[PDB]
Amino acid sequence: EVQKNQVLTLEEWQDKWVNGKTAFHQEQGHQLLKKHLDTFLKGKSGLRVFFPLCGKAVEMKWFADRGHSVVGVEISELGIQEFFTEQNLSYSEEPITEIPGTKVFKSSSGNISLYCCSIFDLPRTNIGKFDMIWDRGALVAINPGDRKCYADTMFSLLGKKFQYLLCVLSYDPTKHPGPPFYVPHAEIERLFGKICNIRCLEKVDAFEERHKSWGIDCLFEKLYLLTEK
Ligand SMILES: Nc1ncnc2c1ncn2[C@@H]1O[C@H](CSCC[C@H](N)C(=O)O)[C@@H](O)[C@H]1O
């Protein structure tokens, strides 16, 4: 209930990128994913992997380097450009014909495509189906009221068998209004429990010096693996 009425705008997010206020970004990449990556990919070849609200997530290159095709969606053209610049990847552009005024950025390698539009635009595209989702700073970045629509959008993107990897943050929601927002276990169950087997693989201290600026003094991260019932 606490953060329920928080409504951020796309322009606010784009402004963060313009202003360099991108402290959510992890240059060395996600350490829980790094730990479990081989287990998740064991026996797997040429998967399609989706990154909602992808920013310039370095982990997209982890999957592409391992032979999987990666699609991300990110509202900030600046963040997308920073991804290609930082990963030293050439790219070219095409329109997203269904959503006038927007573009998809395609790595020359053919392995990474970043849609520069809203995640909520995707059901009107032919983005298709995915074997795997990496969701970090995404479900937690969405306006709280938008979570059900987001969850339904995720389901629309999933193949019959899937591994949905989900990172959420645990902190006292009365101390920081978000983002990132507080998504408790019960909320995961509400959104994903009917369709998914839910495993919480990790719960680790995530508190860094930068988190003092949110007015909290404890922060934990949980890594979930959601799969078909
Ligand atoms: N509706 C929306 N559609 C697409 N991108 C959105 C969005 N709302 C917010 N964003 C983008 O979502 C990102 C959340 S911050 C997390 C970024 C990235 N997943 C990482 O792990 O580092 C921002 O880059 C923001 O610009």
Q: How many residues does the chain have?
A: 229
3-class state of residue 70 by DSSP: strand
Do residues 198 and 163 touch, judged by C-beta distance below 8 A? no
Q: How far apart are CA 29 and CA 121, in angstroms?
A: 27
Atom of ligand 1 nearest to the CA of 30: 21
- Resolution of the deposited coordinates, in angstroms? 1.6
Confirm or reject: Cβ of 131 under 6 Å from ligand 1: no
Q: What residues contact residue 48 under an 8 Å CB cut-off, 6+ apart?
A: 68, 69, 71, 128, 129, 130, 131, 132
Strands 130-135 and 48-51: parallel
Q: How far apart are CA 11 and CA 201, in angstroms?
A: 35
Pocket mutation for ligand 1, best pick of 13, 105, 147 (most atoms within 8 Å of C-beta): 13
Question: What CA–CA distances, in Å, run from 21 to 43, 58, 165?
Answer: 39, 17, 26
113: domain CATH number is: 3.40.50.150
Q: How far apart are CA 2 and CA 194, in angstroms?
A: 25
Structure tokens at 127: 């983005």
Q: How far apart are CA 210 and CA 217, in angstroms?
A: 11
The total number of structural domains in the chain stands at 1
Q: Residue ranges of the alpha helices (H) in the chain?
A: 10-19, 31-41, 59-65, 77-86, 147-156, 185-192
Calculate how far, in angstroms, residue 186's C-alpha sits from the geometric centre of ligand 1: 23
Do residues 133 and 164 touch, judged by C-beta distance below 8 A? yes
DSSP letter (8 states) at residue 95: E
Backbone angles phi, psi at 11, to 5 degrees: -65, -40
Do residues 164 and 135 touch, judged by C-beta distance below 8 A? yes
Structure tokens at 136: 């970090």
Cis omega (within 30 of 0) on the bond before 173? Answer: no
Q: What residues contact residue 113 under an 8 Å CB cut-off, 6+ apart?
A: 69, 70, 71, 72, 104, 105, 106, 107
Which domain, by its residues, includes 79? 1-229
Q: What's the order of all strands across the beta sheet hosting 103-107?
A: 91-95, 103-107, 112-116, 69-73, 48-51, 130-135, 158-170, 220-228, 196-205
Does the CA dihedral 137-50-68-44 come out positive or negative?
positive
3-class state of residue 116 by DSSP: strand
Atom of ligand 1 nearest to the CA of 180: 15
β-pair partners for 81: none
Atom of ligand 1 nearest to the CA of 16: 26
- Print burial letters for 36-63: b (CB count within 10 Å at least 16), e (below 16): bbeebbeeeeebbbbbbbbbbbbbbbbb
Tell which residue, 171, 179, 178, has the closest CA to residue 205: 171
Which protein residue's CA is at the shortest distance from atom 1 of ligand 1? 118
Calculate how far, in angstroms, residue 137's C-alpha sits from the geometric centre of ligand 1: 7
Q: How far apart are CA 91 and CA 103, in angstroms?
A: 12
